[PDB]
Design a protein around this ligand. Structure first.
Ligand SMILES: Cc1ccc(NC(=O)c2ccc(CN3CCN(C)CC3)cc2)cc1Nc1nccc(-c2cccnc2)n1
Ligand SMILES: O=c1ccn([C@@H]2O[C@H](COP(=O)(O)OP(=O)(O)O)[C@@H](O)[C@H]2O)c(=O)[nH]1
Ligand SMILES: O=c1ccn([C@@H]2O[C@H](COP(=O)(O)OP(=O)(O)O)[C@@H](O)[C@H]2O)c(=O)[nH]1
Ligand SMILES: Nc1ccn([C@H]2C[C@H](O)[C@@H](COP(=O)(O)O)O2)c(=O)n1
Ligand SMILES: [Mg+2]
Lengths: 229, 230
């Protein structure tokens, strides 16, 4: 089977930018991008933007978004496992975010932020729990690449990307998710219902400096982490 | 193997009355109660109550949240029943109080048409339903459907006979809109579904208009009949 690697990080940290660098560095190295486009134009597998609806009235749409987001990821991630990489010697599938960061970082943060009531949040937890243990050892990650950046850098990279929905985001929101990231992957004190995660290796890279051209060091680091996997 | 039959019908038609009768008749006969119907009385049941109270309170906000949890519940209950006591029983039949297809094609459909679910809610629901079902519940495919036919008028009476105070509000107009949905689907079979096999699933239509609580003999004799013909 394929080594499943997850690239984690805050909003605008540099996930797609870095994951594209690695994507290009090898055949049998493939990527599973977060389906942000499906959330942008809700068309069935013209249509509304559920990423916008959530940022505009989070108290109204957080649960509906958080649900479609996770489901769209699950779908995509599975769909890739079946991809050409199946018939390819020594393969590596690089996932842009994971089912673990949807719940324990974003959805968790919204419930805490009072944008999901106890009921909304319980339903989501039971759904995520039940739904995830229906694959077994299928979507289990082999390793995690944490792309570390200040919530300050993120706010600036949000303002470079220039996606309308998120131009309203305050430092405080990024600051909240940052802390959640640090507790999950750096200090590793964020307990999850996924007991295997406890023994999963994490490579933490400080992607604060504009690595777009100065990325050789970052790539040397991934290649070493992957050998040890 | 276990034969899957679903009991379909409008509100207060007599589904829960019939699934109880059938349950008592055979050791080989097991029944799967509607999650909604239960909640119309342990976190899976605690959430149920909460969401159903909000559902009545403001259907414009909780239609998606409800039709979602109520359907995941159904899949979870039915997948659990398949691995139950019937597994090693000589000639087993599993009766389902309403199906995963009625949730979507009658109720969830009606709520999108009521404007209680917007287009974006509706797109996501249809997509969530298409996926959940094609992955997890591919076994929960039906062997047959027993339609419990009753005039919207009959149901309106049996809603009072029931007495659930929230239910006492339900207009005849609402029951008439749901009636025509059932009739188009199961009786005329003009209702188009995303599930291709439902074009050739056998349907026994029973006229539950007369009180069957005490004269259920013939009704069961026609079921016994239908079961052999699968
Ligand atoms: C369980 C429930 C409670 C209330 C409602 N609907 C309403 O209560 C309601 C109220 C007003 C309108 C019309 N009006 C349109 C315009 N907008 C702005 C307001 C509403 C429509 C529906 C649906 C449901 N949904 C539902 N879904 C599945 C099953 C059942 C159900 C209920 C009882 C017994 N058996 C099954 N019920
Ligand atoms: O070294 C870097 C990495 C990222 N970015 C910019 O930061 C924004 C967000 O990047 P990305 O989509 O990769 O972030 P993600 O949210 O996927 O982590 C984009 O405008 C990038 O060009 C940048 O200027 N320099
Ligand atoms: O032959 C019958 C069947 C049902 N009922 C009454 O109909 C009401 C609702 O029945 P049920 O719960 O079976 O309906 P469902 O909503 O499940 O279709 C209850 O008060 C029953 O006692 C009745 O009077 N006679
Ligand atoms: N469960 C999730 C997943 C993603 N997002 C948002 C954050 C971004 O605005 C976008 C995904 O792109 P990014 O790579 O910038 O995080 O969706 C969210 O709020 N909740
Ligand atoms: Mg992105």
């Amino acid at each position: 089977r394929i080594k499943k690697i997850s690239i984690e990080g805050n909003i605008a940290a540099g996930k797609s930018t870095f994951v594209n660098i690695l994507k290009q560095l090898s055949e049998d190295w493939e990527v599973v991008p977060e389906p942000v486009a499906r959330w942008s134009n809700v068309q069935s597998t013209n249509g509304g933007n559920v990423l916008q609806m959530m940022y505009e009235k989070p108290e109204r749409w957080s649960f509906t978004f958080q649900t479609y987001a996770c489901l769209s990821r699950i779908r995509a991630q599975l769909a890739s496992l079946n991809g050409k990489l199946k018939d390819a010697e020594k393969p590596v599938l690089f996932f842009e975010r994971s089912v673990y960061s949807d719940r324990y970082i974003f959805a968790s943060n919204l419930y805490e932020s009072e944008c999901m009531n106890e009921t909304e949040w319980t339903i989501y937890q039971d759904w995520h729990d039940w739904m995830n243990n229906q694959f077994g050892q299928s979507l289990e990650l082999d390793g995690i690449i944490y792309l570390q950046a200040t919530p300050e850098t993120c706010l600036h990279r949000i303002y470079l990307r220039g996606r309308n929905e998120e131009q309203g985001i305050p430092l405080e929101y990024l600051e909240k998710l940052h802390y959640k990231h640090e507790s999950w992957l750096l200090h590793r004190t964020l307990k999850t219902n996924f007991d295997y995660l406890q023994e999963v290796p994490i490579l933490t890279l400080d992607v604060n400096e504009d690595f777009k051209d100065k990325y050789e060091s970052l790539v040397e680091k991934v290649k070493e982490f992957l050998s040890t996997l």
